[PDB]
Design a protein around this motif. Structure first.
Motif, PDB file in Angstrom:
ATOM      1  N   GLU A  23      35.843  37.787  27.642  1.00  0.00           N
ATOM      2  CA  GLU A  23      35.855  37.872  29.099  1.00  0.00           C
ATOM      3  C   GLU A  23      37.185  37.369  29.628  1.00  0.00           C
ATOM      4  OE1 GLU A  23      32.460  35.822  30.908  1.00  0.00           O
ATOM      5  OE2 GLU A  23      31.420  36.047  28.978  1.00  0.00           O
ATOM      6  N   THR A  24      37.546  37.812  30.823  1.00  0.00           N
ATOM      7  CA  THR A  24      38.788  37.376  31.444  1.00  0.00           C
ATOM      8  C   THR A  24      38.549  35.966  31.982  1.00  0.00           C
ATOM      9  OG1 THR A  24      38.088  38.435  33.507  1.00  0.00           O
ATOM     10  CG2 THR A  24      39.554  39.692  32.052  1.00  0.00           C
ATOM     11  N   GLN A  26      37.564  33.268  34.152  1.00  0.00           N
ATOM     12  CA  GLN A  26      36.687  33.283  35.325  1.00  0.00           C
ATOM     13  C   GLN A  26      36.992  32.285  36.439  1.00  0.00           C
ATOM     14  OE1 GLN A  26      34.818  36.429  33.589  1.00  0.00           O
ATOM     15  NE2 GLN A  26      34.414  35.610  35.638  1.00  0.00           N
ATOM     16  N   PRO A  29      39.589  34.483  40.981  1.00  0.00           N
ATOM     17  CA  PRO A  29      39.402  35.926  41.181  1.00  0.00           C
ATOM     18  C   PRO A  29      40.523  36.812  40.637  1.00  0.00           C
ATOM     19  CG  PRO A  29      40.124  34.922  43.202  1.00  0.00           C
ATOM     20  CD  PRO A  29      39.743  33.789  42.272  1.00  0.00           C
ATOM     21  N   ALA A  32      40.011  36.889  37.070  1.00  0.00           N
ATOM     22  CA  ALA A  32      38.675  37.388  36.756  1.00  0.00           C
ATOM     23  C   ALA A  32      38.523  38.887  36.991  1.00  0.00           C
ATOM     24  CB  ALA A  32      37.635  36.620  37.578  1.00  0.00           C
ATOM     25  N   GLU A  33      39.061  39.375  38.105  1.00  0.00           N
ATOM     26  CA  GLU A  33      38.965  40.793  38.441  1.00  0.00           C
ATOM     27  C   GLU A  33      40.086  41.652  37.859  1.00  0.00           C
ATOM     28  OE1 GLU A  33      36.837  39.943  42.799  1.00  0.00           O
ATOM     29  OE2 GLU A  33      38.685  41.133  42.664  1.00  0.00           O
ATOM     30  N   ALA A  34      41.006  41.024  37.133  1.00  0.00           N
ATOM     31  CA  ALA A  34      42.113  41.761  36.536  1.00  0.00           C
ATOM     32  C   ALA A  34      41.584  42.907  35.682  1.00  0.00           C
ATOM     33  CB  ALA A  34      42.966  40.832  35.690  1.00  0.00           C
ATOM     34  N   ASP A  35      42.338  43.998  35.634  1.00  0.00           N
ATOM     35  CA  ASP A  35      41.929  45.146  34.847  1.00  0.00           C
ATOM     36  C   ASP A  35      41.959  44.753  33.374  1.00  0.00           C
ATOM     37  OD1 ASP A  35      41.473  47.619  33.685  1.00  0.00           O
ATOM     38  OD2 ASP A  35      43.491  48.366  34.107  1.00  0.00           O
ATOM     39  N   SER A 159      45.692  30.919  44.461  1.00  0.00           N
ATOM     40  CA  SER A 159      44.331  30.953  43.969  1.00  0.00           C
ATOM     41  C   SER A 159      44.096  29.754  43.063  1.00  0.00           C
ATOM     42  CB  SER A 159      44.074  32.234  43.189  1.00  0.00           C
ATOM     43  OG  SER A 159      43.993  33.338  44.065  1.00  0.00           O
ATOM     44  N   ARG A 281      41.251  39.919  28.117  1.00  0.00           N
ATOM     45  CA  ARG A 281      40.021  39.251  27.691  1.00  0.00           C
ATOM     46  C   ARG A 281      40.191  38.144  26.663  1.00  0.00           C
ATOM     47  NH1 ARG A 281      35.433  44.157  28.045  1.00  0.00           N
ATOM     48  NH2 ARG A 281      35.248  43.949  30.322  1.00  0.00           N
TER      49      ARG A 281
END
Lengths: 398, 398
Positions: A23-24, A26, A29, A32-35, A159, A281
């Protein structure tokens, strides 16, 4: 023909890229939301070549991979003694234990853990430097080695500053023990912007190659860092880079490295190559899943392992020509201890205890203080045997 | 002329030998009453040279310096999987913590601490081997690398077996966790005889060079150990050899090493040299005082540091000759990834997308699987460009 390495890399991208576990990060954001569907690799050679494949040109925040560079800068600006009083050399996990500061050392374990990186940032330019000066010093050192002015990604910075309690905790504890002098918020802000510097897989490989060559930029041949400083940085990357899993990592991969939570992995194998890998990830311990996997592969398939010796050795002697009354000795390559010792063996292997010896250094690319001193000594001794020694050295290197 | 290195070593002996701090191992008389006024150094080159000075020929029990060799033997006789189930790769101090066995691994941390060495001895020949077989296997592996039948010093063995409670404690705990199968007394007896094998500073340097070359004996050129096994042993020597002080040692000295309580220090720098040092008195942590000091010196004065890259690189290409319609490519040295990649660069640097290319491997000393495969690929590609490729290889090495 086309070079086969970039194709080998392309295959790895396709093979290892067939899956995307983990997982990226967390905690924020932007990360976390990165492609997650991005994966690049890049290898930089000491001679200036750059082989890559996949998303090796996509920018991403360097994060923890910035620690070896700011550490190098601190060593250059303050000297070993001043930095060593605040930063140790003991490998350890990221989990903090106050007892480490209670030691008579009163310093965080090493420069690869957050506590050590904060202490390093505080040392960056000098005792009187401003917040701005130290931050630009971090960016400058990273830019000089990458070969280009790098930029900070303020979206990530902000962030991260919104959730920087842990780092503020480490900085505040360090101040109580005297490791930091300025404010906790100030040093944490600098370290976080530092981690927000954008880089690509290719920047990391180039940057890693500078370290791998002893501080020589592969693309320009110019010396960016004194070799004793690069030696130190790569040593700590090896013993602490992959934390307490450094023992298994040194054995299984053998490549000095450091990973960042954005998916980047920095590699620097002394004398051979710089590595850069990118893949968002993370595995269970915070390192790029495929990034880590790619490294193990380069190590196994190409034998790019620290414990795999590759040296000039006797090849330092291109050839010995006994014309008649005189001997012609031609040298080549990067002559350091290994080659020099071999050249000394060659001289000794002559019965001079022949009336003239000619040292040809035309084929030699360079020679370090150890090689010069050793060869210079072999010349003194040859002459003392009543032998004539003429050093034909075009570009005065001796 | 005379070779300057053995003279440099002679100087170190005189300089460092001007003082004699520390104490000999007090746990037994034979070691406690040993003559402290002895000090030798020996460096073995990959090509077979041996430089020494001082008491480099005085025999002394190898002790803990025997751990990397029995570990190599175990890996060869049982395979990585069988050994890795019983011996970890995590660096750690000699102080024992049961929690290390409670881990789901159920194995001592590594092969350089006593607990790990006992687990290794138990694995030596196979599941059904006898006490005698395993002990002779330890002596055989150490003898094969030294280049001579080595002997056990039973006086030391007996003195040590009279005070072997700590080791019996470690062996008994290991059995309770299933790491040992035979009796505690049996495995401890084997390990203690193993530590009583007599060697000289020169044996250690030669032995260390075998490891430094990937398992090639420098004196005969014969392969004593598969390279993947030597790679593993030197990796663990690096991450655990000097215990929890391995981080400072890797940074300050950069030479994979292991010390014994009799005053001996083993060194193995991949691709460059094997080191052997002898000096009875130990510092506060059990390592040879001057032995440790001598290593730091060789590292600083000659730059014999793991993080100091020394590689063939582009020198793998002796020269490119464009006669007319055909190109002559002469190679040399030990071609591994570094050189091969450079040879591939040379081929690509030709516009073939010239009607014939000739590969001259006469000057090449050898080439590993990585180099063969890479060069073989460059040939396939050249031919595919409609180019004629003829490999002039006298001693079929390709």
């Amino acid at each position: 023909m086309r070079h086969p390495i970039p194709d080998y890399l392309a295959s790895l991208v396709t093979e290892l890229g067939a899956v995307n576990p983990g997982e990226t990060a967390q905690y924020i954001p932007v990360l976390a939301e990165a492609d997650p569907d991005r994966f690049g690799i890049a290898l930089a050679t000491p001679t200036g070549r750059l082989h890559c494949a996949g998303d090796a040109d996509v920018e991403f925040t360097i994060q923890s991979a910035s620690k070896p560079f700011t550490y190098a800068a601190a060593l250059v600006d303050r000297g070993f003694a001043a930095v060593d009083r605040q930063v140790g050399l003991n490998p350890s996990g990221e989990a903090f234990n106050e007892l480490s500061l209670e030691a008579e050392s009163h310093r965080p374990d090493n420069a690869m853990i957050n506590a050590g990186a904060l202490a390093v940032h505080q040392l960056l330019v000098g005792p009187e430097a401003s917040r701005k000066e130290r931050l630009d010093r971090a960016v400058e050192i990273m830019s000089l080695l990458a070969g280009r002015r790098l930029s900070v990604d303020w979206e990530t910075y902000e962030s991260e500053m919104a959730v920087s309690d842990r780092n503020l905790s480490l900085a505040h504890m360090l101040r109580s023990y005297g490791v930091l002098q300025d404010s906790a918020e100030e040093i944490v802000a600098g370290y976080v912007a530092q981690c927000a510097v954008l880089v690509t897989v290719k920047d990391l490989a180039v940057m890693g190659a500078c370290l791998a060559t002893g501080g020589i930029h592969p693309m320009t041949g110019e010396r960016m860092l004194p070799s004793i400083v690069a030696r130190r940085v790569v040593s700590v990357m090896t013993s602490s880079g992959m934390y307490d899993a450094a023992g298994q990592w040194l054995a299984d991969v053998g490549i000095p490295a450091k990973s960042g939570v954005a998916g980047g992995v920095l590699g620097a194998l002394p004398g051979r190559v710089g590595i850069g890998v990118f893949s968002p990830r993370l595995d269970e311990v915070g390192n790029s899943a495929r990034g880590v996997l790619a490294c193990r592969r380069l190590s196994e398939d190409f034998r790019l392992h620290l414990m795999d010796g590759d040296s000039l050795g006797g090849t330092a002697v291109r050839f010995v020509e006994r014309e008649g009354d005189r001997v012609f000795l031609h040298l080549q390559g990067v002559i350091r201890f290994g080659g020099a010792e071999a050249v000394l063996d060659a001289l000794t292997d002559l019965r001079t205890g022949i009336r003239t010896v000619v040292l040809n250094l035309a084929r030699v690319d360079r020679i370090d203080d150890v090689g010069r001193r050793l060869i210079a000594e072999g010349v003194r001794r040859l002459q003392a045997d009543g032998v004539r020694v003429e050093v034909e050295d075009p570009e005065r290197i001796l």
